[PDB]
Scaffold this motif. Structure first.
Motif, PDB file in Angstrom:
ATOM      1  N   UNK A 146       3.652   5.851  -5.564  1.00 14.88           N
ATOM      2  CA  UNK A 146       3.570   5.832  -7.022  1.00 14.88           C
ATOM      3  C   UNK A 146       2.470   6.792  -7.449  1.00 14.88           C
TER       4      UNK A 146
ATOM      5  N   UNK B  59       0.852  -1.189   0.000  1.00 13.88           N
ATOM      6  CA  UNK B  59       0.000   0.000   0.000  1.00 13.88           C
ATOM      7  C   UNK B  59       0.885   1.234   0.000  1.00 13.88           C
TER       8      UNK B  59
ATOM      9  N   UNK C   4       4.163   1.464  -1.312  1.00 16.31           N
ATOM     10  CA  UNK C   4       4.710   1.533  -2.651  1.00 16.31           C
ATOM     11  C   UNK C   4       3.659   2.109  -3.597  1.00 16.31           C
ATOM     12  N   UNK C   5       2.413   1.678  -3.432  1.00  7.54           N
ATOM     13  CA  UNK C   5       1.299   2.138  -4.261  1.00  7.54           C
ATOM     14  C   UNK C   5       1.100   3.640  -4.127  1.00  7.54           C
TER      15      UNK C   5
ATOM     16  N   UNK D 165      -0.429   8.607  -8.857  1.00  6.78           N
ATOM     17  CA  UNK D 165      -1.283   8.246  -9.975  1.00  6.78           C
ATOM     18  C   UNK D 165      -0.694   7.137 -10.823  1.00  6.78           C
TER      19      UNK D 165
ATOM     20  N   UNK E  33      -2.142   3.582  -9.515  1.00  8.22           N
ATOM     21  CA  UNK E  33      -3.460   3.041  -9.831  1.00  8.22           C
ATOM     22  C   UNK E  33      -3.409   2.142 -11.058  1.00  8.22           C
ATOM     23  N   UNK E  34      -2.538   2.478 -12.007  1.00  9.65           N
ATOM     24  CA  UNK E  34      -2.379   1.692 -13.231  1.00  9.65           C
ATOM     25  C   UNK E  34      -1.583   0.423 -12.964  1.00  9.65           C
ATOM     26  N   UNK E  35      -0.561   0.546 -12.121  1.00 11.47           N
ATOM     27  CA  UNK E  35       0.287  -0.583 -11.763  1.00 11.47           C
ATOM     28  C   UNK E  35      -0.551  -1.611 -11.023  1.00 11.47           C
ATOM     29  N   UNK E  36      -1.397  -1.129 -10.116  1.00  8.68           N
ATOM     30  CA  UNK E  36      -2.262  -2.009  -9.340  1.00  8.68           C
ATOM     31  C   UNK E  36      -3.235  -2.740 -10.256  1.00  8.68           C
TER      32      UNK E  36
END
Lengths: 202, 142, 142, 202
Positions: free
Chosen positions: C116, C110, C112-113, C118, C121-124
């Motif tokens: 990152x 969470x 690392x997210x 914006x 959200x794409x990586x997730x």
């Protein structure tokens, strides 16, 4: 033009341990032009050139993607090269993983028994696949099969049957002479597309 | 248990509906969901890890997405429901999501307590010793 | 584990401080905390039962009491803290309160997210397939 | 007066399987007056008379409270009776459970060895206690003991020592002749009071 164009698209087309990369050629491609294929393993920011030059529109990346079924996949890319100049890289739209592997069966055996036909579905035994890495090993559960049976002599129509195992049994009405079968595998838990098998008759 | 193979395929199919949208936008190539997460999943803290992850996607990741890129908003949503659905079947099959399973004994009791109104607060407090005993017993079973 | 025998005695001693106040006010004589509750405690839903019960007392029972009879308000409170305390040591000793133990892998992720922003959200969303796989793996371990 | 008075107080005083109920007499009690003792098991709304009449100020409820260590306790009560008239019931303030049981040791053995004294704490073996229901059985963990040692000849002073087992060892300085010990048991996890044991000397 100033710079060299990029391959419009780059995508994978794989069977169980037959991971072939594909791409569409650039326009007005001279004979002297080729492509550079590079591999990216997901979880490692670093590309690796696999072929400096390939005068084809596809490449077999199996040798280098042998970990597909135990990894989080890869990213593949291509760029045209001619002389000292080259184009932008064109990477595959999605990450290549086992999800993009098209399921296929090794072959099908048909036996004449009591008063029926017994089918034995032989799964793919690709030569390069690691010893431990078997099909049943990768896809250990929910392997199902869609079955197509055609009588011969007869028109080109088929009877569709669904089986939960590598062996099925088709009762015989007698009157029919020869029968031909084809099989389409899938995995109840995955959405992988499957490839119909080649005609198999008795 | 019941029909979990199909629940997976549903989740997967819903994903293929937005797979190309996202994997085209993510230009970094490091792994977010480390194998570490997989390990927790394999450990006793497994149930809690899986719940936190479902929660994460459903509350943080997806909502934030649908409200950042409307185009696939409905698609992101369709996937989200497939997740909620899968969540239900998981705790309805014990073995999988127990950490989200609320004790029936506790419900019944909370009821009896409320059906006692003010007489209940005294009954609860008076049986506190009984509570410690259960706590104590429970521990013993470790 | 560490020092749980003393944690019990502390809880008990705190109880003896208000034992006579309450057990003098409760004139009904049925058992609120049925043996049923004890059974859950002995079952897989044990951790959740115990957590729900601690929560129950701490949020419903005790507060309502302290604010119904001020005389022992401080005493009810002193007992409540003894409970919170005991709760901590329980999940700090895994085996006992894991269902209240938040996955470390999930926290790191969470972070690392969020680090990152914006781009996260794409990586997730792009690794959602990886998520289903873990979910899938996890189940297998059942 | 119009009606008969009630026992001012009613409380328990118990040792391991020695559950004696107690009460204070009503004022101006005539010889012809006695008390009725009744038992209530927690978890069952229904009292049970144990003694219709008792000309004492206590009663042994052990025979009827044998489940104490496996139950959620009881409620006891008393009411004075004289002739056809009786008083209000006076119930115990708290619920009687194992928490109100005063811990005691069965006895203590002292042995003369190499160059020290060995103590063996024998736990209470009440005759009425169920066969399976042993002290170690009820209190299976955290049994500790406070130990008091007095030399003799000598003044009336003691050395305090703390032990985690039913057997302890006291090194000897030699010069001392006789020694006497007493023990006080407890359970680290419970707040039960404990009873000092009777003098035990060598």
């Amino acid at each position: 033009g100033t710079e060299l164009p990029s391959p419009p698209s780059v995508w994978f087309e794989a069977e169980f341990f037959h991971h072939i990369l594909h791409w569409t050629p650039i326009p007005q491609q001279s004979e002297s032009t080729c492509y550079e294929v590079a591999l990216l393993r997901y979880g490692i920011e670093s590309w690796n050139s696999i072929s400096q030059c390939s005068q084809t529109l596809s490449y077999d990346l199996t040798a280098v993607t042998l970990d597909l079924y135990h990894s989080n996949g890869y990213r593949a890319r291509v760029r045209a090269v001619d002389g000292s100049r080259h184009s932008q890289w064109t990477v595959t739209n999605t990450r290549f993983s086992v999800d993009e592997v098209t399921l296929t069966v090794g072959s099908v055996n048909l036996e004449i028994h009591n008063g029926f036909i017994l089918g034995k579905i032989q799964l793919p035994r690709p030569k390069m696949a690691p010893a431990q890495d078997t099909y049943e090993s990768i896809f250990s559960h929910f392997r199902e099969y869609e079955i197509a049976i055609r009588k011969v002599p007869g028109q080109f129509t088929f009877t569709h049957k669904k089986v939960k195992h590598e062996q099925f049994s088709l009762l015989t009405s007698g009157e029919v002479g020869e029968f031909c079968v084809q099989v389409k595998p899938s995995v109840a838990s995955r959405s992988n597309k499957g490839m119909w098998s080649k005609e198999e008759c008795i | 248990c019941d029909n979990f193979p199909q629940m997976l395929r549903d989740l997967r199919d819903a994903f293929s509906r937005v797979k190309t949208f996202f994997q085209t936008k993510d230009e970094v190539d490091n792994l977010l969901l480390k194998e570490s997460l997989l390990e927790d999943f394999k450990g006793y803290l497994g149930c809690q890890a899986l719940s936190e992850m479902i929660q994460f996607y459903l509350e943080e990741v997806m909502p934030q997405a649908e409200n950042q890129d409307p185009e696939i908003k409905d698609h992101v949503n369709s996937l989200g429901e497939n997740l909620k659905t899968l969540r239900l079947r998981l705790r309805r099959c014990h073995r999988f999501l127990p950490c989200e399973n609320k004790s029936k004994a506790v419900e019944q009791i909370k009821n009896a307590f409320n059906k006692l109104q003010e007489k209940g607060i005294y009954k609860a407090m008076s049986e506190f010793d009984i509570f410690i005993n259960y706590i104590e017993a429970y521990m013993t079973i470790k």
